[PDB]
Amino acid sequence: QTIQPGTGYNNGYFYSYWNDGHGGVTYTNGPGGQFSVNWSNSGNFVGGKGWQPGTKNKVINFSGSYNPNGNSYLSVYGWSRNPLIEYYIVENFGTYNPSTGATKLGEVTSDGSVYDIYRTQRVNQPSIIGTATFYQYWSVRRNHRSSGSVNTANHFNAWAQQGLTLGTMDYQIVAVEGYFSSGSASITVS
Numbered sequence: 001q002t003i004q005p006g007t008g009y010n011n012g013y014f015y016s017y018w019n020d021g022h023g024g025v026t027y028t029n030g031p032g033g034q035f036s037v038n039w040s041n042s043g044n045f046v047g048g049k050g051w052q053p054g055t056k057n058k059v060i061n062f063s064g065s066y067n068p069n070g071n072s073y074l075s076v077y078g079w080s081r082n083p084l085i086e087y088y089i090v091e092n093f094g095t096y097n098p099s100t101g102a103t104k105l106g107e108v109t110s111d112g113s114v115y116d117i118y119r120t121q122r123v124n125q126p127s128i129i130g131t132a133t134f135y136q137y138w139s140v141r142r143n144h145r146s147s148g149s150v151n152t153a154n155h156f157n158a159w160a161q162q163g164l165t166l167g168t169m170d171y172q173i174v175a176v177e178g179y180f181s182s183g184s185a186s187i188t189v190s
């Protein structure tokens, strides 16, 4: 169903839906690993389904329709603890590339495309443990797609070889994120 911000479990999958207080976002959980989101001139929001906790070797499948009208991402997204890391494996995005506000460490050729690897430091920002300073890791897919499989180990291992350490996994989802834009998306995760 259409729900408010929060986390929980639906039809066998963990879900997280968060936003910054700006309206215009409707997030809806569907059967199995499906969710859909429709946003009209939202602020920043992140919503999707997956697992709690994630793993460092999960092969994640996703498929659906993704129609962003502005700044938005479709990613495998999650966190670790000790160290506290927020990470992204971006499979598709709108008008804004993550490369802008991050620093490139290398590349990895995975699941049919080269991805550029970046790290950014979030200073005194919101997190799964409250206001904190922590690193963000990115793999950004050069060839955007709306379906396929992501072997997360390819990215975690590549990040490790570049000196990017991951802690013990917290949640791991396929998420649609928007940032002051509009759009629609419907995705099934497994």
Ligand code: NA
Pocket: 092, 093, 094, 144
């Ligand atoms: Na795109």
Ligand code: NA
Pocket: 123, 124, 125, 126
């Ligand atoms: Na801040």
